[PDB]
Amino acid sequence: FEKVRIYRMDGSYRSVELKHGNNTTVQQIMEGMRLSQETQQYFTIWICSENLSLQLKPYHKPLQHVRDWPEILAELTNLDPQRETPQLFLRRDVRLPLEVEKQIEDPLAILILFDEARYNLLKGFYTAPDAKLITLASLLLQIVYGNYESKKHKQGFLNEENLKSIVPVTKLKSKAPHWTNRILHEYKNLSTGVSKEMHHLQRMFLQNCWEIPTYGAAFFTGQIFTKVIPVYVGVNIKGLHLLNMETKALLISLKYGCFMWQLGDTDTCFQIHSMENKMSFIVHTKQAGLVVKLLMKLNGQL
Protein backbone atom coordinates (compact mmCIF):
# COMPACT_ATOMS: atom_id res chain seq x y z
CA PHE A 1 0.00 0.00 0.00
CA GLU A 2 1.28 3.44 -0.97
CA LYS A 3 -0.13 6.94 -0.57
CA VAL A 4 0.80 10.59 -1.00
CA ARG A 5 -0.07 13.81 0.80
CA ILE A 6 -1.63 16.49 -1.42
CA TYR A 7 -1.29 19.84 0.32
CA ARG A 8 -3.18 23.09 0.00
CA MET A 9 -1.75 26.56 0.61
CA ASP A 10 -2.97 26.77 4.20
CA GLY A 11 -0.91 23.78 5.32
CA SER A 12 -3.79 21.30 5.22
CA TYR A 13 -3.40 18.03 3.31
CA ARG A 14 -5.37 15.08 2.07
CA SER A 15 -3.76 11.71 1.62
CA VAL A 16 -4.52 9.84 -1.57
CA GLU A 17 -3.70 6.21 -2.37
CA LEU A 18 -1.22 5.56 -5.21
CA LYS A 19 -2.92 2.65 -6.94
CA HIS A 20 -0.18 2.43 -9.58
CA GLY A 21 2.80 3.47 -7.47
CA ASN A 22 5.02 6.15 -8.96
CA ASN A 23 3.23 5.50 -12.27
CA THR A 24 0.04 7.00 -10.76
CA THR A 25 -1.12 9.99 -12.83
CA VAL A 26 -2.34 13.45 -11.87
CA GLN A 27 -5.76 12.38 -13.23
CA GLN A 28 -5.95 9.34 -10.95
CA ILE A 29 -4.79 11.37 -7.93
CA MET A 30 -7.44 14.00 -8.65
CA GLU A 31 -10.03 11.22 -8.30
CA GLY A 32 -8.97 10.69 -4.69
CA MET A 33 -9.56 14.29 -3.66
CA ARG A 34 -12.94 15.33 -2.19
CA LEU A 35 -13.95 17.28 -5.29
CA SER A 36 -16.84 16.39 -7.61
CA GLN A 37 -16.50 15.65 -11.33
CA GLU A 38 -17.59 19.23 -11.99
CA THR A 39 -15.27 20.89 -9.47
CA GLN A 40 -12.15 18.87 -10.38
CA GLN A 41 -12.10 20.92 -13.59
CA TYR A 42 -11.22 24.07 -11.59
CA PHE A 43 -8.10 22.64 -9.99
CA THR A 44 -5.12 20.42 -10.64
CA ILE A 45 -1.89 19.13 -9.16
CA TRP A 46 1.17 21.36 -8.97
CA ILE A 47 4.63 20.36 -7.84
CA CYS A 48 6.19 23.12 -5.72
CA SER A 49 9.43 24.03 -4.00
CA GLU A 50 10.75 27.38 -2.78
CA ASN A 51 12.48 28.12 -6.08
CA LEU A 52 9.94 26.65 -8.52
CA SER A 53 6.23 25.81 -8.72
CA LEU A 54 4.94 24.00 -11.82
CA GLN A 55 1.43 23.01 -12.87
CA LEU A 56 1.28 19.35 -13.86
CA LYS A 57 -0.67 17.89 -16.80
CA PRO A 58 -3.33 15.18 -16.38
CA TYR A 59 -1.08 12.48 -17.89
CA HIS A 60 1.92 13.46 -15.71
CA LYS A 61 3.13 11.13 -12.94
CA PRO A 62 3.75 13.49 -9.99
CA LEU A 63 5.95 11.10 -7.99
CA GLN A 64 8.42 10.74 -10.86
CA HIS A 65 8.63 14.53 -11.09
CA VAL A 66 9.42 14.55 -7.37
CA ARG A 67 12.04 11.86 -8.05
CA ASP A 68 13.47 13.82 -10.98
CA TRP A 69 13.41 17.24 -9.26
CA PRO A 70 17.22 17.75 -9.24
CA GLU A 71 17.28 17.10 -13.00
CA ILE A 72 14.19 19.28 -13.55
CA LEU A 73 15.88 22.06 -11.59
CA ALA A 74 19.10 21.87 -13.57
CA GLU A 75 17.03 22.03 -16.76
CA LEU A 76 14.69 24.92 -15.92
CA THR A 77 16.75 27.15 -13.64
CA ASN A 78 20.21 28.73 -13.35
CA LEU A 79 20.45 27.37 -9.81
CA ASP A 80 23.17 25.13 -8.40
CA PRO A 81 22.04 21.83 -6.80
CA GLN A 82 19.48 22.49 -4.06
CA ARG A 83 18.57 20.59 -0.88
CA GLU A 84 14.79 20.92 -0.93
CA THR A 85 12.31 18.15 -1.71
CA PRO A 86 9.27 19.48 -3.57
CA GLN A 87 5.73 18.79 -2.41
CA LEU A 88 2.49 18.21 -4.28
CA PHE A 89 -0.25 20.86 -4.01
CA LEU A 90 -3.83 21.18 -5.20
CA ARG A 91 -4.22 24.62 -6.77
CA ARG A 92 -6.27 26.59 -9.30
CA ASP A 93 -5.79 25.41 -12.89
CA VAL A 94 -4.05 28.32 -14.67
CA ARG A 95 -6.38 27.78 -17.67
CA LEU A 96 -9.60 28.34 -15.71
CA PRO A 97 -11.42 31.18 -17.46
CA LEU A 98 -12.42 34.07 -15.17
CA GLU A 99 -15.94 34.01 -16.66
CA VAL A 100 -16.25 30.41 -15.48
CA GLU A 101 -14.81 31.09 -12.02
CA LYS A 102 -17.18 34.05 -11.54
CA GLN A 103 -20.12 31.67 -11.57
CA ILE A 104 -18.83 28.96 -9.20
CA GLU A 105 -21.13 28.58 -6.18
CA ASP A 106 -19.81 25.29 -4.76
CA PRO A 107 -18.69 25.91 -1.13
CA LEU A 108 -15.61 23.65 -1.35
CA ALA A 109 -14.39 25.19 -4.60
CA ILE A 110 -14.90 28.68 -3.21
CA LEU A 111 -12.95 28.02 -0.01
CA ILE A 112 -10.06 26.38 -1.93
CA LEU A 113 -9.87 29.30 -4.36
CA PHE A 114 -10.22 31.67 -1.41
CA ASP A 115 -7.34 30.15 0.55
CA GLU A 116 -5.06 30.28 -2.49
CA ALA A 117 -5.93 33.91 -3.23
CA ARG A 118 -5.31 34.82 0.43
CA TYR A 119 -1.93 33.12 0.17
CA ASN A 120 -0.98 35.20 -2.88
CA LEU A 121 -2.19 38.41 -1.25
CA LEU A 122 -0.06 37.98 1.89
CA LYS A 123 2.92 36.84 -0.17
CA GLY A 124 2.85 40.18 -2.02
CA PHE A 125 1.93 38.81 -5.48
CA TYR A 126 -1.14 41.01 -5.75
CA THR A 127 -0.41 44.63 -6.52
CA ALA A 128 -3.44 46.83 -5.88
CA PRO A 129 -4.24 50.32 -4.58
CA ASP A 130 -4.40 50.84 -0.82
CA ALA A 131 -8.20 51.10 -0.79
CA LYS A 132 -8.40 47.63 -2.35
CA LEU A 133 -5.90 46.08 0.09
CA ILE A 134 -7.88 47.63 2.95
CA THR A 135 -11.14 46.10 1.74
CA LEU A 136 -9.43 42.69 1.49
CA ALA A 137 -7.96 43.03 5.01
CA SER A 138 -11.38 43.87 6.46
CA LEU A 139 -12.95 40.79 4.88
CA LEU A 140 -10.21 38.58 6.28
CA LEU A 141 -11.00 40.02 9.72
CA GLN A 142 -14.72 39.25 9.35
CA ILE A 143 -13.88 35.74 8.14
CA VAL A 144 -11.51 34.88 11.02
CA TYR A 145 -12.84 36.95 13.97
CA GLY A 146 -16.54 37.13 13.10
CA ASN A 147 -18.47 40.33 13.79
CA TYR A 148 -16.74 43.58 14.72
CA GLU A 149 -17.24 44.36 18.38
CA SER A 150 -16.09 47.78 19.61
CA LYS A 151 -15.15 46.25 22.97
CA LYS A 152 -12.76 43.82 21.25
CA HIS A 153 -11.46 45.55 18.16
CA LYS A 154 -11.47 49.33 18.46
CA GLN A 155 -8.21 49.63 20.39
CA GLY A 156 -5.18 47.44 21.05
CA PHE A 157 -6.37 44.74 18.67
CA LEU A 158 -4.63 45.16 15.28
CA ASN A 159 -0.96 44.73 16.25
CA GLU A 160 2.07 43.68 14.20
CA GLU A 161 1.41 39.97 14.82
CA ASN A 162 -2.10 39.89 13.40
CA LEU A 163 -1.62 42.56 10.73
CA LYS A 164 0.72 40.06 9.07
CA SER A 165 -2.29 37.82 8.50
CA ILE A 166 -4.39 40.44 6.68
CA VAL A 167 -2.02 42.57 4.54
CA PRO A 168 0.84 41.79 2.14
CA VAL A 169 4.21 41.18 3.79
CA THR A 170 5.51 43.87 1.40
CA LYS A 171 3.31 46.51 3.06
CA LEU A 172 3.47 45.23 6.61
CA LYS A 173 6.24 47.47 7.98
CA SER A 174 5.93 50.31 5.45
CA LYS A 175 2.38 51.67 5.25
CA ALA A 176 0.03 49.03 6.70
CA PRO A 177 0.43 50.49 10.23
CA HIS A 178 -1.29 53.65 8.94
CA TRP A 179 -4.27 51.78 7.54
CA THR A 180 -5.24 50.33 10.91
CA ASN A 181 -8.06 52.81 11.54
CA ARG A 182 -9.25 52.50 7.91
CA ILE A 183 -9.17 48.71 8.18
CA LEU A 184 -11.22 48.69 11.41
CA HIS A 185 -13.84 51.06 10.01
CA GLU A 186 -14.37 48.90 6.94
CA TYR A 187 -14.55 45.85 9.22
CA LYS A 188 -17.18 47.60 11.39
CA ASN A 189 -19.34 48.64 8.43
CA LEU A 190 -19.11 45.09 7.15
CA SER A 191 -20.69 43.95 10.42
CA THR A 192 -23.40 46.60 10.78
CA GLY A 193 -27.48 43.72 4.33
CA VAL A 194 -24.46 41.57 3.50
CA SER A 195 -24.59 37.81 4.17
CA LYS A 196 -22.16 36.87 6.95
CA GLU A 197 -22.25 33.21 5.94
CA MET A 198 -18.66 31.97 5.53
CA HIS A 199 -18.78 31.03 1.86
CA HIS A 200 -20.44 34.29 0.85
CA LEU A 201 -17.67 36.18 2.66
CA GLN A 202 -15.05 34.08 0.89
CA ARG A 203 -16.63 34.80 -2.51
CA MET A 204 -16.63 38.55 -1.70
CA PHE A 205 -12.91 38.30 -0.99
CA LEU A 206 -12.51 36.53 -4.35
CA GLN A 207 -14.60 39.14 -6.23
CA ASN A 208 -12.12 41.77 -5.07
CA CYS A 209 -9.17 39.66 -6.27
CA TRP A 210 -10.71 38.89 -9.68
CA GLU A 211 -10.00 42.40 -10.98
CA ILE A 212 -6.37 42.35 -9.86
CA PRO A 213 -4.42 41.97 -13.14
CA THR A 214 -2.12 39.17 -11.91
CA TYR A 215 -4.99 37.10 -10.48
CA GLY A 216 -4.59 33.38 -11.13
CA ALA A 217 -1.11 33.72 -12.55
CA ALA A 218 1.40 30.94 -12.96
CA PHE A 219 4.78 32.38 -11.90
CA PHE A 220 8.14 31.65 -13.48
CA THR A 221 11.57 33.07 -12.68
CA GLY A 222 13.95 34.99 -14.91
CA GLN A 223 16.15 38.05 -15.34
CA ILE A 224 16.08 41.24 -17.41
CA PHE A 225 18.92 43.69 -17.91
CA THR A 226 18.37 47.42 -17.47
CA LYS A 227 22.31 45.71 -14.04
CA VAL A 228 20.64 42.32 -14.08
CA ILE A 229 17.22 42.28 -12.40
CA PRO A 230 15.81 38.98 -11.13
CA VAL A 231 12.10 38.93 -11.97
CA TYR A 232 8.95 36.87 -11.61
CA VAL A 233 7.25 36.25 -14.90
CA GLY A 234 3.51 35.87 -14.23
CA VAL A 235 1.22 34.45 -16.90
CA ASN A 236 -2.55 34.27 -16.49
CA ILE A 237 -5.81 34.35 -18.45
CA LYS A 238 -5.46 38.15 -18.84
CA GLY A 239 -1.87 38.37 -20.10
CA LEU A 240 1.78 38.72 -19.08
CA HIS A 241 3.12 40.44 -15.96
CA LEU A 242 6.67 41.06 -14.65
CA LEU A 243 7.43 41.51 -10.96
CA ASN A 244 10.65 42.60 -9.33
CA MET A 245 11.64 39.37 -7.56
CA GLU A 246 12.89 41.08 -4.40
CA THR A 247 10.20 43.73 -3.86
CA LYS A 248 7.28 42.21 -5.81
CA ALA A 249 6.81 45.61 -7.50
CA LEU A 250 4.81 45.36 -10.73
CA LEU A 251 7.20 46.32 -13.53
CA ILE A 252 5.10 45.41 -16.56
CA SER A 253 1.49 44.36 -17.09
CA LEU A 254 0.26 43.54 -20.62
CA LYS A 255 -3.15 42.24 -21.77
CA TYR A 256 -3.50 39.66 -24.56
CA GLY A 257 -3.93 41.38 -27.93
CA CYS A 258 -1.66 44.22 -26.86
CA PHE A 259 1.68 42.47 -27.18
CA MET A 260 3.55 39.78 -29.09
CA TRP A 261 6.14 37.24 -27.99
CA GLN A 262 9.05 35.48 -29.63
CA LEU A 263 10.91 32.50 -28.24
CA GLY A 264 14.63 33.15 -28.56
CA ASP A 265 17.41 31.09 -30.18
CA THR A 266 16.91 28.11 -27.87
CA ASP A 267 14.63 28.06 -24.82
CA THR A 268 16.96 30.48 -23.04
CA CYS A 269 14.99 33.70 -23.43
CA PHE A 270 11.94 35.33 -24.94
CA GLN A 271 11.32 38.79 -26.37
CA ILE A 272 8.18 40.87 -25.82
CA HIS A 273 7.07 43.64 -28.18
CA SER A 274 4.28 46.09 -27.45
CA MET A 275 1.77 46.46 -30.26
CA GLU A 276 0.94 49.95 -28.98
CA ASN A 277 3.92 51.85 -27.54
CA LYS A 278 6.58 50.18 -29.73
CA MET A 279 8.68 49.29 -26.70
CA SER A 280 10.16 45.88 -26.02
CA PHE A 281 12.22 43.78 -23.66
CA ILE A 282 13.98 40.44 -23.37
CA VAL A 283 13.51 38.10 -20.42
CA HIS A 284 16.33 35.64 -19.76
CA THR A 285 15.08 32.31 -18.31
CA LYS A 286 15.41 28.58 -18.97
CA GLN A 287 11.66 28.41 -18.49
CA ALA A 288 11.23 30.52 -21.66
CA GLY A 289 9.75 27.55 -23.51
CA LEU A 290 7.17 26.94 -20.78
CA VAL A 291 6.23 30.63 -20.64
CA VAL A 292 5.71 30.92 -24.41
CA LYS A 293 3.72 27.65 -24.61
CA LEU A 294 1.42 29.01 -21.92
CA LEU A 295 1.09 32.49 -23.46
CA MET A 296 0.01 30.72 -26.66
CA LYS A 297 -2.55 28.52 -24.95
CA LEU A 298 -4.07 31.25 -22.81
CA ASN A 299 -4.13 33.80 -25.62
CA GLY A 300 -5.65 31.07 -27.77
CA GLN A 301 -8.65 30.39 -25.54
CA LEU A 302 -9.40 34.16 -25.75
Binding site: K3, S12, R14, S15, L108, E161, M198
Partner: protein, 168 residues
Protein backbone atom coordinates in the same frame (compact mmCIF):
# COMPACT_ATOMS: atom_id res chain seq x y z
CA UNK B 1 2.42 34.33 19.36
CA UNK B 2 -0.60 32.17 18.56
CA UNK B 3 -0.31 28.78 20.21
CA UNK B 4 -0.83 25.64 18.10
CA UNK B 5 -2.93 22.62 19.11
CA UNK B 6 -2.59 19.14 17.61
CA UNK B 7 -6.03 17.51 17.80
CA UNK B 8 -6.80 13.93 16.69
CA UNK B 9 -10.20 12.51 15.75
CA UNK B 10 -10.43 8.76 16.23
CA UNK B 11 -13.17 6.13 16.06
CA UNK B 12 -14.67 3.41 13.88
CA UNK B 13 -15.63 3.68 10.22
CA UNK B 14 -18.69 5.73 9.35
CA UNK B 15 -19.23 7.43 12.71
CA UNK B 16 -18.83 10.92 11.28
CA UNK B 17 -15.23 11.85 12.08
CA UNK B 18 -14.81 13.51 8.69
CA UNK B 19 -18.27 15.07 8.75
CA UNK B 20 -17.57 16.57 12.19
CA UNK B 21 -14.15 17.87 11.15
CA UNK B 22 -15.39 19.35 7.84
CA UNK B 23 -18.44 20.90 9.44
CA UNK B 24 -16.21 22.49 12.08
CA UNK B 25 -13.48 23.66 9.70
CA UNK B 26 -15.28 24.33 6.42
CA UNK B 27 -18.92 24.72 7.49
CA UNK B 28 -20.03 22.10 4.99
CA UNK B 29 -22.26 19.09 5.47
CA UNK B 30 -23.29 16.73 2.71
CA UNK B 31 -24.74 13.21 2.82
CA UNK B 32 -22.06 12.21 0.32
CA UNK B 33 -18.88 10.98 1.96
CA UNK B 34 -15.37 10.09 0.82
CA UNK B 35 -13.39 7.42 2.68
CA UNK B 36 -10.36 8.63 4.65
CA UNK B 37 -6.73 7.55 4.68
CA UNK B 38 -5.44 10.57 6.60
CA UNK B 39 -6.43 14.23 6.35
CA UNK B 40 -5.12 17.24 8.21
CA UNK B 41 -7.02 20.49 8.60
CA UNK B 42 -6.06 23.83 10.02
CA UNK B 43 -8.34 26.44 11.61
CA UNK B 44 -7.89 29.54 13.75
CA UNK B 45 -10.46 29.89 16.53
CA UNK B 46 -10.92 31.87 19.75
CA UNK B 47 -11.12 29.87 22.98
CA UNK B 48 -11.33 31.74 26.30
CA UNK B 49 -10.45 35.12 24.74
CA UNK B 50 -7.31 33.59 23.19
CA UNK B 51 -6.71 33.03 19.47
CA UNK B 52 -5.73 29.40 18.83
CA UNK B 53 -4.41 27.62 15.78
CA UNK B 54 -5.88 24.14 15.59
CA UNK B 55 -4.41 21.30 13.56
CA UNK B 56 -6.98 18.52 13.34
CA UNK B 57 -6.07 15.06 12.08
CA UNK B 58 -8.97 13.13 10.56
CA UNK B 59 -8.09 9.46 10.62
CA UNK B 60 -8.91 6.18 8.96
CA UNK B 61 -11.26 4.27 11.24
CA UNK B 62 -9.26 1.11 10.64
CA UNK B 63 -6.30 -0.76 12.16
CA UNK B 64 -4.59 -0.13 8.83
CA UNK B 65 -1.83 2.48 8.84
CA UNK B 66 -0.25 1.35 12.10
CA UNK B 67 2.72 3.71 11.76
CA UNK B 68 0.15 6.50 11.64
CA UNK B 69 -1.77 5.18 14.67
CA UNK B 70 1.32 5.03 16.89
CA UNK B 71 2.39 8.44 15.64
CA UNK B 72 -1.05 10.00 16.21
CA UNK B 73 -0.96 9.04 19.83
CA UNK B 74 2.64 10.07 20.37
CA UNK B 75 2.10 13.51 18.84
CA UNK B 76 -1.57 14.19 19.55
CA UNK B 77 -2.25 16.70 22.34
CA UNK B 78 -5.99 15.99 22.54
CA UNK B 79 -8.21 13.22 21.25
CA UNK B 80 -11.85 13.06 20.22
CA UNK B 81 -13.13 9.48 20.43
CA UNK B 82 -16.22 9.38 18.25
CA UNK B 83 -18.90 6.73 17.99
CA UNK B 84 -22.31 6.75 16.37
CA UNK B 85 -25.41 6.54 18.57
CA UNK B 86 -26.90 4.43 15.75
CA UNK B 87 -24.22 1.72 15.82
CA UNK B 88 -23.51 -0.31 18.96
CA UNK B 89 -20.35 -1.81 17.49
CA UNK B 90 -18.72 1.65 17.17
CA UNK B 91 -19.41 2.40 20.86
CA UNK B 92 -17.92 -0.96 21.87
CA UNK B 93 -14.74 -0.27 19.87
CA UNK B 94 -13.75 2.88 21.76
CA UNK B 95 -12.46 1.08 24.88
CA UNK B 96 -9.24 -0.15 23.22
CA UNK B 97 -8.56 3.25 21.67
CA UNK B 98 -8.81 4.76 25.13
CA UNK B 99 -6.42 2.17 26.64
CA UNK B 100 -3.92 2.54 23.78
CA UNK B 101 -3.75 6.33 24.24
CA UNK B 102 -3.14 6.06 28.00
CA UNK B 103 -0.50 3.42 27.38
CA UNK B 104 1.41 5.58 24.85
CA UNK B 105 1.18 8.76 26.94
CA UNK B 106 2.11 6.81 30.09
CA UNK B 107 -0.47 8.79 32.08
CA UNK B 108 -4.24 8.91 32.51
CA UNK B 109 -4.00 12.70 32.37
CA UNK B 110 -4.74 12.98 28.61
CA UNK B 111 -7.02 15.63 27.01
CA UNK B 112 -9.88 13.55 25.67
CA UNK B 113 -13.56 13.82 24.90
CA UNK B 114 -16.04 11.03 24.26
CA UNK B 115 -18.36 11.97 21.38
CA UNK B 116 -21.68 10.34 20.57
CA UNK B 117 -22.28 11.52 17.04
CA UNK B 118 -25.40 11.54 14.80
CA UNK B 119 -27.60 12.58 17.70
CA UNK B 120 -30.07 13.98 15.18
CA UNK B 121 -30.96 10.46 14.05
CA UNK B 122 -33.05 9.81 17.18
CA UNK B 123 -35.34 7.27 15.46
CA UNK B 124 -32.30 5.02 14.87
CA UNK B 125 -30.66 5.54 18.27
CA UNK B 126 -29.16 2.31 19.61
CA UNK B 127 -26.70 3.68 22.19
CA UNK B 128 -28.56 5.37 25.04
CA UNK B 129 -27.21 8.74 26.18
CA UNK B 130 -27.05 7.28 29.70
CA UNK B 131 -24.68 4.61 28.36
CA UNK B 132 -22.40 7.23 26.83
CA UNK B 133 -22.41 9.02 30.20
CA UNK B 134 -21.77 5.69 31.92
CA UNK B 135 -18.70 5.09 29.73
CA UNK B 136 -17.27 8.61 30.24
CA UNK B 137 -17.64 8.21 34.00
CA UNK B 138 -15.93 4.83 33.84
CA UNK B 139 -13.11 6.69 32.07
CA UNK B 140 -12.28 8.82 35.13
CA UNK B 141 -15.14 11.26 34.46
CA UNK B 142 -13.84 12.01 30.97
CA UNK B 143 -15.65 14.77 29.03
CA UNK B 144 -18.71 13.64 27.03
CA UNK B 145 -20.93 15.22 24.35
CA UNK B 146 -23.61 14.07 21.95
CA UNK B 147 -23.17 15.77 18.61
CA UNK B 148 -24.55 16.12 15.10
CA UNK B 149 -22.42 17.17 12.12
CA UNK B 150 -25.66 17.59 10.20
CA UNK B 151 -27.49 19.90 12.59
CA UNK B 152 -24.36 21.53 14.07
CA UNK B 153 -25.07 20.39 17.59
CA UNK B 154 -21.98 20.42 19.81
CA UNK B 155 -19.61 20.50 16.82
CA UNK B 156 -17.47 23.47 17.91
CA UNK B 157 -17.72 22.44 21.54
CA UNK B 158 -15.81 19.22 20.85
CA UNK B 159 -12.68 21.03 19.74
CA UNK B 160 -13.05 23.93 22.17
CA UNK B 161 -13.25 21.46 25.09
CA UNK B 162 -10.04 19.72 24.04
CA UNK B 163 -8.27 23.09 23.80
CA UNK B 164 -9.39 24.05 27.30
CA UNK B 165 -8.12 20.68 28.59
CA UNK B 166 -4.78 21.19 26.87
CA UNK B 167 -4.61 24.66 28.44
CA UNK B 168 -4.94 23.17 31.94
Amino acid sequence: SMREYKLVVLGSVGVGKSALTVQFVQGIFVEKYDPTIEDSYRKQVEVDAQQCMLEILDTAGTEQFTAMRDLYMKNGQGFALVYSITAQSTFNDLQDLREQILRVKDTDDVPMILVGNKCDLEDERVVGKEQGQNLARQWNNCAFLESSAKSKINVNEIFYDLVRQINR
